[PDB]
Amino acid sequence: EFYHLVDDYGRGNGFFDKFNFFTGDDPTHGYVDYVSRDVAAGAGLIGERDGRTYMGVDFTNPASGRGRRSVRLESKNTYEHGLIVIDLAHMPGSVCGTWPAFWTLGTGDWPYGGEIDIIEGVNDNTFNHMVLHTSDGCTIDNDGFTGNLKTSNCYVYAPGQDANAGCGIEATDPNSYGKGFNSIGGGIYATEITPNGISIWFFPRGSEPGDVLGDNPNPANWDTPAAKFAGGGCDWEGKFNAQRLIFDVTFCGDWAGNVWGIGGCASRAANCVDFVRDNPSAFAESYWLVNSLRVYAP
Q1: What cystine pairs are annotated (predicted)?
Q2: From the candidates 120, 192, 208, 285, which is the catalytic residue?
């Protein structure tokens, strides 16, 4: 009643069988070499670790070619309305030069089917950033969530914002991302998509509701979400269509590479690319460790 399970991703190979591995050049122009499932398996980039599904990057070899090896998985199934719940024991760390994301992407030409970034950040970020990217004509209200609103216009080319900033909300818990998240053993991110808006809850390890992992979650009884995107400034139903789930870690590129120079990573090397190419050992923490991924429908 309210929500029922429609898709449990399981773990290991059964989990990977539910995704297509993207191998094209990075759309965000990162210094990354997305590899095939076979190559990933052969490189230790994907697998299982004590029952948890693992997806990481090459932290052994000096990089060459398109960039450091990683994987980008995009789900075979798509969902228009629903509740996506991911329980993570570990996510890519706050590593200089990286840009991990767990997100959703609509069908058709971007940004017309919408995009939802659930877990995303760069370099040595502390806080998670939850963000929507849409076509023109979608802004959100500033209430109903605990995070800090950074940009109110979800349009990817919104007038007063950096290109492709979208409408983002920054989480206030320092354990919501990277280093901190991993120090507590991770947690759960649940995101609900309805005809009236999107909500994303973050439950640090141990603080989750008793029904969040079960077969009939009821978000209506959960604590205030970390981010909520709603309001009359957007036709929620028309701005987002069927979404596929995506996991990736890219390096440098349009965001991480672009801000390398003004942050705490500037001292590691003159450029982001030089650091990522020459310091493989730095990326050992850049991996996802999934306990479960389950999608529900109303």
Answers
A1: 96-265, 138-234, 154-167, 252-272
A2: 120
Domains of the chain as residue ranges with CATH: 1-298 (2.60.120.200)
* Structure-block tokens of residue 77: 């199934």
- DSSP conformation letters of 187-230: EEEEEEEETTEEEEEEEETT---TTSSSSS--GGGSPPPSEEEE
Structure token digits, residue 23 = 């191998």
Please name the residue that has the structure tokens 């940009």: 151
Q: Is 192 one of the catalytic residues? A: no
Resolution of this entry, Å: 2.0
User: Which method was it determined by?
Assistant: X-ray
Is residue 115 annotated as a catalytic residue, yes or no? yes
Residue closest to 55 by CA, chosen among 284, 246, 289: 289
Residues contacting residue 97 through CB under 8 Å, at least 6 positions apart: 123, 251, 252, 256, 260, 265, 268, 272, 275, 276, 282, 283
Tell me which of 1, 115, 170, 208 is the catalytic residue.
115
